Amino acid sequence: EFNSQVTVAVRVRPFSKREKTEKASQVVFTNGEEITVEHPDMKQVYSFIYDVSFWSFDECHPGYASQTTVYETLAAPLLDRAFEGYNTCLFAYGQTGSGKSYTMMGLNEEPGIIPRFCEDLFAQIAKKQTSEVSYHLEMSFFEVYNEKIHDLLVCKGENGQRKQPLRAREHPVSGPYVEGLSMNVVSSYSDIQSWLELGNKQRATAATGMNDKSSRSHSVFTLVMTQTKTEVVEGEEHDHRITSRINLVDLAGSERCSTAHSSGQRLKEGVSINKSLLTLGKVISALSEQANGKRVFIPYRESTLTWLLKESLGGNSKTAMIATVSPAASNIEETLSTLRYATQARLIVNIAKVNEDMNAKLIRELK
Amino acid sequence: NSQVTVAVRVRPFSKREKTEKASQVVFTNGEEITVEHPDMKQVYSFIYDVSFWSFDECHPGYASQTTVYETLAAPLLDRAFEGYNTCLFAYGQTGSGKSYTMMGLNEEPGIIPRFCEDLFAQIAKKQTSEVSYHLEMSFFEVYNEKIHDLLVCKGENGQRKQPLRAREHPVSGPYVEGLSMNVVSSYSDIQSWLELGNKQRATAATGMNDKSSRSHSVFTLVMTQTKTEVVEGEEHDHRITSRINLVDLAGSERCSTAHSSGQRLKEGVSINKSLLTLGKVISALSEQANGKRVFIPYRESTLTWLLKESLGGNSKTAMIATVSPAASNIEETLSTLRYATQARLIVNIAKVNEDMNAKLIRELK
Ligand SMILES: Nc1ncnc2c1ncn2[C@@H]1O[C@H](COP(=O)(O)OP(=O)(O)O)[C@@H](O)[C@H]1O
Ligand SMILES: Nc1ncnc2c1ncn2[C@@H]1O[C@H](COP(=O)(O)OP(=O)(O)O)[C@@H](O)[C@H]1O
Ligand SMILES: [Mg+2]
């Protein structure tokens, strides 16, 4: 009966060193909810509406959306629903050097969404930690690189090459998953921060022409929260459990080989990123046409990313998209591709449900 | 016209099998003998007339020492005083607790002492100085189809086990030629002779324990009840003789699990043959009591031969089987339980033990 719509949001980034050296023009203007793109040639103007818009272009102009603002507007509802008993997903999308990693992870003195999410989660837990409710939290953090899966939260052994790949499998009920994945327990913010540091140090980064710290890999942060609660029953208590999966996803960029001066491994990994975005795009185009009566088959098996995220793009999750765009005029068509895929993702509808861990057993038939 | 009163008696976990987490295989649901294979390959069911669930105290029906005596042995005493013969067989494997079930310990005593004390008490109560009761006793063993007396001390030799032979008196029935009969008046007089005889009984260290019986044991009480004559003349004219028999058989002992070594293979065969004959006799008597014409094979074993008159006519026969509830002794418990069933066994399987969430059907119905 529920049909949860996907929460699309947009973030305009300020000018970069490259776009200031080449004195590129501003074309992405905002008025609040709406985002418009006045082409330089002045032959046509496009405009798009979204649930949420962020304008980090100027640190002084009114309407400046900060890390705390994007958090409190996007992630806090997802935290409320995750405590309610829903699965949640927040995934970034955009081009190279557009503010996806800065938006989600952030830097040391400019945190992104992930640390704030974990911090507020643990705060609400410590503030609701009664004997009525117990809380158990597991985390995983993994990487997709040249269609191979990798665990980020391990201390690699010394060798000429030490990256042990994992395999993806399909459980008939739970859906796709990764076999051999470290699921580490967490009690408070400190362990989370240490694991995040280890993961962001093990992640794949390189220096390319459009970002010196360009992530060469998709990154997924999974939190499994199990909250146990009681009901006065014929015997002992502690007989309700609610599980929730929170998937925070930072993806890479399209990376045109001409601008991004690339030869060898960068081309190779870059090409892999291009094949991962093409598949993802095709899955967001088929999910936006399957929510309009037309019947379509979503291709999730053509990429490990979309295969693992089968349950988030569709299926059972409350999901949100952060499109990242640059205001320069030298990237208009790529910004527009991002905005068109975001406006199509707006039309996605999922079926989110409470994970009472009791269906078909006894209280399903009570109900 | 009397069928056997077969009864079973499960024992509780001991120290070793409670420490080593040996799981329970024998359970109770009113039939009180259901065996769930630990792999749940088969669920057997062993309906019995009487059964004593001495597994854990908190269950209703914890059959204690007093319970088993007052239930199964005291009728044999009330019947002995009626002028009729009785036999009580004890069957169990090494470790089931047959000794603690029949004899008992200094605490929580057993069938033998309860029977003897109640006998002496009822005698002293019914005694009038016009009626009198006299008790003599004998104690022998059957070994490799041969007879031996247990109350005869032996001298200096390798060993002095002399064989006696059985003979049929045309009226008194079968008996042993050369058996020692000894008078008694109190339970110490019996306990002394028993602690003497169980030292000369046959025992050897086989594949099971070093103290495992390899011979059947018969303990016989002969009771003479004499009443006087009021018409005129001699007393000793109204005499009633009763025979109580307390037997202790050995184990079936399969050779597959115990590579018999020449002399441990001559005793297992004999025991296996005697148990088969005993089973045929009991099944034929049960079928007789339910209105059939059959023939009881007394003659295929010295045991049944000498116990003919105690296993036929107006006599009372009981058999108490002792079993363990551990999964370590499943092959032995099923053996003990199959040799005791005078009915049809019921084997089945269905994994309803764990319906996923508290009897799905109660609300899915
Ligand atoms: N809102 C912002 N304020 C200040 N600097 C920003 C902002 N957004 C992005 N940047 C800068 O731009 C770069 C973003 O690179 P990154 O987001 O990692 O690329 P990608 O999104 O392709 O992974 C960083 O060096 C960061 O300092
Ligand atoms: N029904 C019972 N209840 C409690 N304890 C028992 C029971 N049967 C046996 N036991 C304990 O286990 C032992 C009995 O085993 P035992 O008589 O040595 O076996 P067997 O007589 O077959 O050689 C005794 O030590 C006794 O304390
Ligand atoms: Mg990045």
GROMACS .gro file of N, CA, C and O in nm, chain A residues 250-334:
model
  340
  250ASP      N    1   2.912   0.685  -0.231
  250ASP     CA    2   2.988   0.787  -0.302
  250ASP      C    3   3.045   0.724  -0.428
  250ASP      O    4   3.130   0.635  -0.420
  251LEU      N    5   2.997   0.770  -0.543
  251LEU     CA    6   3.041   0.720  -0.672
  251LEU      C    7   3.137   0.819  -0.738
  251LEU      O    8   3.151   0.934  -0.695
  252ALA      N    9   3.205   0.769  -0.841
  252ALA     CA   10   3.308   0.845  -0.915
  252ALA      C   11   3.246   0.925  -1.031
  252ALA      O   12   3.123   0.935  -1.037
  253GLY      N   13   3.329   0.977  -1.120
  253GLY     CA   14   3.284   1.060  -1.230
  253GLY      C   15   3.308   1.000  -1.368
  253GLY      O   16   3.386   0.907  -1.386
  254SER      N   17   3.239   1.059  -1.466
  254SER     CA   18   3.242   1.008  -1.603
  254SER      C   19   3.383   1.011  -1.662
  254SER      O   20   3.424   0.918  -1.731
  255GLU      N   21   3.457   1.118  -1.636
  255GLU     CA   22   3.600   1.123  -1.669
  255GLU      C   23   3.632   1.110  -1.817
  255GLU      O   24   3.684   1.007  -1.861
  256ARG      N   25   3.599   1.211  -1.897
  256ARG     CA   26   3.641   1.217  -2.036
  256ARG      C   27   3.793   1.209  -2.045
  256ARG      O   28   3.864   1.286  -1.979
  257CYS      N   29   3.842   1.116  -2.128
  257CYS     CA   30   3.986   1.092  -2.138
  257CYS      C   31   4.061   1.212  -2.194
  257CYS      O   32   4.179   1.230  -2.164
  258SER      N   33   3.996   1.293  -2.278
  258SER     CA   34   4.064   1.409  -2.336
  258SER      C   35   4.104   1.508  -2.227
  258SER      O   36   4.222   1.538  -2.209
  259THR      N   37   4.005   1.561  -2.155
  259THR     CA   38   4.036   1.653  -2.046
  259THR      C   39   4.117   1.584  -1.937
  259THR      O   40   4.227   1.627  -1.903
  260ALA      N   41   4.064   1.475  -1.883
  260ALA     CA   42   4.137   1.397  -1.783
  260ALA      C   43   4.248   1.323  -1.855
  260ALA      O   44   4.228   1.212  -1.905
  261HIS      N   45   4.367   1.383  -1.858
  261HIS     CA   46   4.479   1.328  -1.934
  261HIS      C   47   4.517   1.194  -1.874
  261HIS      O   48   4.574   1.189  -1.764
  262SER      N   49   4.485   1.086  -1.945
  262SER     CA   50   4.486   0.952  -1.888
  262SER      C   51   4.546   0.853  -1.986
  262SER      O   52   4.509   0.850  -2.104
  263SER      N   53   4.640   0.773  -1.937
  263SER     CA   54   4.694   0.662  -2.014
  263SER      C   55   4.730   0.549  -1.919
  263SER      O   56   4.795   0.571  -1.816
  264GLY      N   57   4.687   0.429  -1.954
  264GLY     CA   58   4.720   0.311  -1.876
  264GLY      C   59   4.614   0.281  -1.771
  264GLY      O   60   4.495   0.269  -1.802
  265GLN      N   61   4.659   0.268  -1.645
  265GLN     CA   62   4.570   0.228  -1.537
  265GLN      C   63   4.459   0.330  -1.517
  265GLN      O   64   4.344   0.293  -1.487
  266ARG      N   65   4.490   0.459  -1.532
  266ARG     CA   66   4.387   0.561  -1.518
  266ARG      C   67   4.282   0.547  -1.627
  266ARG      O   68   4.162   0.558  -1.600
  267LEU      N   69   4.325   0.518  -1.750
  267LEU     CA   70   4.230   0.496  -1.858
  267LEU      C   71   4.142   0.375  -1.830
  267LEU      O   72   4.021   0.379  -1.853
  268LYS      N   73   4.213   0.269  -1.793
  268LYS     CA   74   4.153   0.138  -1.759
  268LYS      C   75   4.052   0.163  -1.648
  268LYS      O   76   3.932   0.148  -1.676
  269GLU      N   77   4.097   0.206  -1.531
  269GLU     CA   78   4.001   0.231  -1.420
  269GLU      C   79   3.897   0.334  -1.466
  269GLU      O   80   3.778   0.304  -1.447
  270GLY      N   81   3.938   0.442  -1.530
  270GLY     CA   82   3.841   0.540  -1.582
  270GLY      C   83   3.738   0.472  -1.671
  270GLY      O   84   3.619   0.490  -1.644
  271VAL      N   85   3.781   0.388  -1.764
  271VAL     CA   86   3.686   0.317  -1.854
  271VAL      C   87   3.591   0.236  -1.767
  271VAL      O   88   3.470   0.245  -1.791
  272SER      N   89   3.642   0.163  -1.668
  272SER     CA   90   3.555   0.084  -1.578
  272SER      C   91   3.450   0.177  -1.517
  272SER      O   92   3.332   0.144  -1.527
  273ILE      N   93   3.490   0.293  -1.465
  273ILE     CA   94   3.394   0.390  -1.406
  273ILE      C   95   3.290   0.425  -1.513
  273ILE      O   96   3.171   0.419  -1.480
  274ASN      N   97   3.331   0.453  -1.635
  274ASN     CA   98   3.237   0.487  -1.746
  274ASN      C   99   3.139   0.372  -1.770
  274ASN      O  100   3.024   0.402  -1.802
  275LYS      N  101   3.182   0.247  -1.759
  275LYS     CA  102   3.089   0.134  -1.782
  275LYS      C  103   2.998   0.119  -1.660
  275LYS      O  104   2.887   0.069  -1.676
  276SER      N  105   3.043   0.162  -1.543
  276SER     CA  106   2.959   0.150  -1.422
  276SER      C  107   2.851   0.258  -1.426
  276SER      O  108   2.738   0.229  -1.387
  277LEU      N  109   2.886   0.378  -1.469
  277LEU     CA  110   2.787   0.488  -1.477
  277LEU      C  111   2.686   0.460  -1.589
  277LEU      O  112   2.566   0.480  -1.565
  278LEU      N  113   2.729   0.408  -1.704
  278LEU     CA  114   2.635   0.376  -1.815
  278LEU      C  115   2.532   0.278  -1.760
  278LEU      O  116   2.412   0.308  -1.774
  279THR      N  117   2.573   0.171  -1.696
  279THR     CA  118   2.476   0.072  -1.642
  279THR      C  119   2.382   0.141  -1.542
  279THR      O  120   2.260   0.131  -1.562
  280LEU      N  121   2.437   0.206  -1.441
  280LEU     CA  122   2.357   0.277  -1.338
  280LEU      C  123   2.256   0.367  -1.408
  280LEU      O  124   2.137   0.353  -1.379
  281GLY      N  125   2.303   0.452  -1.498
  281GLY     CA  126   2.214   0.540  -1.576
  281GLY      C  127   2.101   0.461  -1.637
  281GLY      O  128   1.986   0.499  -1.612
  282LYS      N  129   2.130   0.354  -1.709
  282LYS     CA  130   2.027   0.268  -1.773
  282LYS      C  131   1.931   0.214  -1.668
  282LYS      O  132   1.815   0.189  -1.704
  283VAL      N  133   1.975   0.193  -1.545
  283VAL     CA  134   1.885   0.138  -1.439
  283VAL      C  135   1.796   0.250  -1.387
  283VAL      O  136   1.684   0.221  -1.347
  284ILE      N  137   1.845   0.373  -1.386
  284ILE     CA  138   1.765   0.489  -1.337
  284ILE      C  139   1.668   0.530  -1.447
  284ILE      O  140   1.566   0.592  -1.414
  285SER      N  141   1.699   0.499  -1.571
  285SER     CA  142   1.610   0.535  -1.685
  285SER      C  143   1.498   0.432  -1.693
  285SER      O  144   1.388   0.470  -1.736
  286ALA      N  145   1.524   0.308  -1.656
  286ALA     CA  146   1.422   0.201  -1.662
  286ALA      C  147   1.335   0.205  -1.536
  286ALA      O  148   1.220   0.160  -1.544
  287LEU      N  149   1.386   0.255  -1.426
  287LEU     CA  150   1.306   0.263  -1.301
  287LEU      C  151   1.213   0.384  -1.311
  287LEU      O  152   1.110   0.384  -1.242
  288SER      N  153   1.249   0.482  -1.391
  288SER     CA  154   1.165   0.604  -1.408
  288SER      C  155   1.061   0.578  -1.516
  288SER      O  156   0.969   0.661  -1.530
  289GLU      N  157   1.075   0.471  -1.592
  289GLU     CA  158   0.976   0.437  -1.697
  289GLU      C  159   0.888   0.324  -1.643
  289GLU      O  160   0.780   0.302  -1.700
  290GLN      N  161   0.933   0.255  -1.540
  290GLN     CA  162   0.853   0.144  -1.480
  290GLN      C  163   0.757   0.205  -1.379
  290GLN      O  164   0.673   0.131  -1.325
  291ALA      N  165   0.772   0.334  -1.350
  291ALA     CA  166   0.681   0.401  -1.255
  291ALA      C  167   0.580   0.483  -1.335
  291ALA      O  168   0.515   0.570  -1.276
  292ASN      N  169   0.568   0.455  -1.465
  292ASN     CA  170   0.474   0.527  -1.555
  292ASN      C  171   0.392   0.425  -1.634
  292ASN      O  172   0.363   0.453  -1.751
  293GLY      N  173   0.359   0.311  -1.574
  293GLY     CA  174   0.276   0.210  -1.641
  293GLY      C  175   0.353   0.123  -1.739
  293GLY      O  176   0.330   0.000  -1.737
  294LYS      N  177   0.442   0.179  -1.819
  294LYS     CA  178   0.514   0.096  -1.919
  294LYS      C  179   0.594  -0.013  -1.845
  294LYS      O  180   0.659   0.021  -1.745
  295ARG      N  181   0.590  -0.136  -1.894
  295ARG     CA  182   0.663  -0.248  -1.828
  295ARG      C  183   0.806  -0.255  -1.882
  295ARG      O  184   0.821  -0.257  -2.006
  296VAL      N  185   0.906  -0.261  -1.795
  296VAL     CA  186   1.048  -0.268  -1.841
  296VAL      C  187   1.126  -0.361  -1.748
  296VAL      O  188   1.083  -0.380  -1.633
  297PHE      N  189   1.234  -0.418  -1.799
  297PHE     CA  190   1.322  -0.509  -1.720
  297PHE      C  191   1.449  -0.433  -1.683
  297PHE      O  192   1.525  -0.398  -1.774
  298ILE      N  193   1.472  -0.408  -1.555
  298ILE     CA  194   1.592  -0.332  -1.509
  298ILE      C  195   1.714  -0.424  -1.515
  298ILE      O  196   1.705  -0.534  -1.459
  299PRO      N  197   1.823  -0.382  -1.579
  299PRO     CA  198   1.945  -0.461  -1.594
  299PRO      C  199   2.040  -0.433  -1.477
  299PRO      O  200   2.118  -0.341  -1.488
  300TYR      N  201   2.035  -0.512  -1.371
  300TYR     CA  202   2.121  -0.489  -1.253
  300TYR      C  203   2.245  -0.578  -1.257
  300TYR      O  204   2.338  -0.550  -1.183
  301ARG      N  205   2.244  -0.684  -1.334
  301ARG     CA  206   2.350  -0.783  -1.346
  301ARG      C  207   2.464  -0.738  -1.437
  301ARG      O  208   2.568  -0.804  -1.439
  302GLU      N  209   2.448  -0.628  -1.510
  302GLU     CA  210   2.554  -0.577  -1.595
  302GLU      C  211   2.656  -0.493  -1.519
  302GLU      O  212   2.744  -0.434  -1.583
  303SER      N  213   2.647  -0.487  -1.387
  303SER     CA  214   2.743  -0.411  -1.307
  303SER      C  215   2.728  -0.450  -1.161
  303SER      O  216   2.616  -0.458  -1.109
  304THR      N  217   2.842  -0.473  -1.095
  304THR     CA  218   2.840  -0.514  -0.955
  304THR      C  219   2.776  -0.409  -0.867
  304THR      O  220   2.709  -0.441  -0.768
  305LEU      N  221   2.795  -0.281  -0.901
  305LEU     CA  222   2.737  -0.173  -0.823
  305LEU      C  223   2.585  -0.184  -0.817
  305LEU      O  224   2.527  -0.197  -0.708
  306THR      N  225   2.524  -0.183  -0.934
  306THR     CA  226   2.376  -0.191  -0.946
  306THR      C  227   2.327  -0.326  -0.895
  306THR      O  228   2.213  -0.331  -0.847
  307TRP      N  229   2.407  -0.430  -0.906
  307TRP     CA  230   2.370  -0.562  -0.856
  307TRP      C  231   2.360  -0.560  -0.704
  307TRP      O  232   2.261  -0.608  -0.647
  308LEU      N  233   2.459  -0.503  -0.637
  308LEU     CA  234   2.453  -0.493  -0.491
  308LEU      C  235   2.345  -0.396  -0.446
  308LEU      O  236   2.280  -0.418  -0.343
  309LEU      N  237   2.324  -0.288  -0.521
  309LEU     CA  238   2.226  -0.186  -0.487
  309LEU      C  239   2.089  -0.213  -0.548
  309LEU      O  240   2.011  -0.119  -0.566
  310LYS      N  241   2.060  -0.339  -0.581
  310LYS     CA  242   1.927  -0.375  -0.630
  310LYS      C  243   1.819  -0.334  -0.532
  310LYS      O  244   1.712  -0.286  -0.572
  311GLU      N  245   1.844  -0.351  -0.402
  311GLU     CA  246   1.743  -0.325  -0.300
  311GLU      C  247   1.726  -0.178  -0.267
  311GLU      O  248   1.633  -0.144  -0.192
  312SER      N  249   1.811  -0.090  -0.319
  312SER     CA  250   1.807   0.053  -0.288
  312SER      C  251   1.745   0.136  -0.400
  312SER      O  252   1.653   0.214  -0.375
  313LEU      N  253   1.795   0.118  -0.521
  313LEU     CA  254   1.738   0.192  -0.637
  313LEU      C  255   1.590   0.156  -0.645
  313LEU      O  256   1.508   0.246  -0.665
  314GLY      N  257   1.560   0.028  -0.630
  314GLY     CA  258   1.425  -0.023  -0.626
  314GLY      C  259   1.402  -0.100  -0.498
  314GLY      O  260   1.473  -0.084  -0.399
  315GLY      N  261   1.299  -0.185  -0.501
  315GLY     CA  262   1.277  -0.276  -0.390
  315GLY      C  263   1.237  -0.203  -0.263
  315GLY      O  264   1.146  -0.120  -0.261
  316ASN      N  265   1.306  -0.236  -0.154
  316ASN     CA  266   1.267  -0.199  -0.018
  316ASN      C  267   1.372  -0.106   0.042
  316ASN      O  268   1.468  -0.151   0.105
  317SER      N  269   1.352   0.024   0.022
  317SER     CA  270   1.431   0.125   0.091
  317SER      C  271   1.370   0.261   0.065
  317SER      O  272   1.309   0.285  -0.039
  318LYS      N  273   1.388   0.350   0.162
  318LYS     CA  274   1.366   0.493   0.143
  318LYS      C  275   1.498   0.553   0.098
  318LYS      O  276   1.596   0.550   0.172
  319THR      N  277   1.501   0.606  -0.024
  319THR     CA  278   1.627   0.640  -0.088
  319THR      C  279   1.627   0.785  -0.132
  319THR      O  280   1.523   0.846  -0.159
  320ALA      N  281   1.748   0.840  -0.137
  320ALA     CA  282   1.768   0.979  -0.172
  320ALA      C  283   1.894   0.994  -0.256
  320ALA      O  284   1.993   0.923  -0.236
  321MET      N  285   1.887   1.088  -0.348
  321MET     CA  286   1.991   1.115  -0.445
  321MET      C  287   2.045   1.255  -0.421
  321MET      O  288   1.968   1.348  -0.397
  322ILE      N  289   2.177   1.269  -0.425
  322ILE     CA  290   2.243   1.399  -0.422
  322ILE      C  291   2.314   1.414  -0.556
  322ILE      O  292   2.420   1.354  -0.579
  323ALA      N  293   2.255   1.493  -0.645
  323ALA     CA  294   2.322   1.532  -0.768
  323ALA      C  295   2.417   1.647  -0.737
  323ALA      O  296   2.382   1.739  -0.663
  324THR      N  297   2.537   1.639  -0.793
  324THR     CA  298   2.640   1.740  -0.773
  324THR      C  299   2.673   1.803  -0.908
  324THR      O  300   2.698   1.732  -1.005
  325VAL      N  301   2.672   1.936  -0.912
  325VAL     CA  302   2.696   2.009  -1.037
  325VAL      C  303   2.791   2.124  -1.012
  325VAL      O  304   2.802   2.176  -0.900
  326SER      N  305   2.861   2.163  -1.118
  326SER     CA  306   2.951   2.275  -1.127
  326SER      C  307   2.887   2.388  -1.207
  326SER      O  308   2.819   2.363  -1.307
  327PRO      N  309   2.907   2.515  -1.168
  327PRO     CA  310   2.836   2.624  -1.235
  327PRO      C  311   2.906   2.678  -1.358
  327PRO      O  312   2.851   2.768  -1.424
  328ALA      N  313   3.025   2.629  -1.390
  328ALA     CA  314   3.098   2.678  -1.506
  328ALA      C  315   3.023   2.646  -1.635
  328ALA      O  316   2.931   2.564  -1.638
  329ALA      N  317   3.064   2.713  -1.743
  329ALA     CA  318   3.003   2.694  -1.873
  329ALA      C  319   3.075   2.589  -1.957
  329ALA      O  320   3.024   2.550  -2.063
  330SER      N  321   3.193   2.543  -1.914
  330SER     CA  322   3.268   2.444  -1.988
  330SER      C  323   3.222   2.301  -1.962
  330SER      O  324   3.286   2.208  -2.012
  331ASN      N  325   3.115   2.280  -1.885
  331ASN     CA  326   3.068   2.148  -1.847
  331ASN      C  327   2.916   2.140  -1.854
  331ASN      O  328   2.852   2.067  -1.777
  332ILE      N  329   2.857   2.214  -1.949
  332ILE     CA  330   2.712   2.230  -1.953
  332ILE      C  331   2.644   2.097  -1.982
  332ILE      O  332   2.548   2.059  -1.915
  333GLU      N  333   2.690   2.026  -2.084
  333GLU     CA  334   2.620   1.905  -2.126
  333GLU      C  335   2.629   1.795  -2.020
  333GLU      O  336   2.532   1.720  -2.002
  334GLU      N  337   2.740   1.788  -1.947
  334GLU     CA  338   2.753   1.689  -1.841
  334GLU      C  339   2.667   1.727  -1.721
  334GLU      O  340   2.600   1.641  -1.661
   0.00000   0.00000   0.00000
